[PDB]
């Protein structure tokens, strides 16, 4: 399949070179996947959701999403123009409040919810969990995402925007998941992302256009901009039979494209998400 005058960062994941403006995926596009956004929400009414969006738990007085980050990680999964699997199903997991914040525990409870409601969700080809959030390190955080993926589910966190060392900052520094930093569209890492040794994998994160709350869009940047770039790619290659939520991490990194982003701190992986889509 083919999408012209896709998003930059869609057309990325599927080149080998920047500054193309297609976007080239196999059309099973994530079918019979699930992709779990655990954030502020999702305003599954949204057009470009086209009924694949629901809201599944929340932690405050709704589960709208009265922020829009949520939806706007949501929208890069799985949504019909500004999505990797245009086809997965999504479900919100609601942690953060309308200000976009969440305590640790009630993020930790909603992490554990996922592991569990999985079970209660049809997801033949694989879960998803999709985290663009982070806070300062704590072992419990770390222990919660690290728990998630050994429940079967592919997680994907944000290597967070302090232009450090992700070690520093959780669920970024736990080991066993998907830590992903950002890139911009001239194959830069973005300025503002974290780096280290506990990074995975970049993808898409400066100017990331996607849906957005009251039924608009819009461009915003952040490492929470690239995981669900990482986390719609691990769900189509779920649905494509390439790999498993045990091993999409590695499997994305092993079919990265590999030494094409500037500014990659030394020791820090220079890998940039890619589909391999041979259209």
């Known amino acids: 399949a083919a999408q012209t005058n896709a998003p930059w960062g869609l057309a990325r994941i599927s080149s080998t070179s920047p500054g193309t403006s297609t976007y080239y995926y196999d059309e099973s596009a994530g079918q019979g996947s699930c992709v779990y956004v655990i954030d502020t929400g999702i305003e599954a009414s949204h057009p470009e959701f086209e009924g694949r969006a629901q809201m599944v738990k929340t932690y405050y007085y709704s589960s709208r999403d009265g922020n829009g980050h949520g939806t706007h990680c949501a929208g890069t999964v799985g949504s019909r123009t500004y999505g990797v699997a245009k086809k997965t199903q999504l479900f919100g997991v609601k942690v953060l409040d309308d200000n976009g914040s969440g305590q640790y525990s009630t993020i930790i409870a909603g992490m554990d919810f996922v592991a569990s409601d999985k079970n209660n969700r049809n997801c033949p080809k694989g879960v998803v969990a999709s985290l663009s959030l982070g806070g300062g390190y704590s072992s419990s955080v770390n222990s919660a995402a ?93 649905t494509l039979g390439k790999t498993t939520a045990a091993s999409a991490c590695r499997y994305i990194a092993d079919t990265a494209n590999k ?6 701190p030394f020791g820090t992986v220079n890998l940039l998400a890619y589909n391999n889509y041979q259209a």
Do not use: K
């Open 146 to 238: 690290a728990r998630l993926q050994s429940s079967g589910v592919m997680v994907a966190v944000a290597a967070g925007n302090n232009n450090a060392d992700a070690r520093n900052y959780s669920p970024a520094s736990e080991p066993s998941v998907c830590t992903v930093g950002a890139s911009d569209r001239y194959d830069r890492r973005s300025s503002f992302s974290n780096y280290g040794s506990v990074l995975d994998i970049f993808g898409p994160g400066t100017s990331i256009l996607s849906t957005w709350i009251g039924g608009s869009t819009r461009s915003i940047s952040g490492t929470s901009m690239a995981t669900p770039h990482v986390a719609g790619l691990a769900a189509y290659l779920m």
């Open 259 to 264: 030494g094409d982003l500037s500014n990659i």
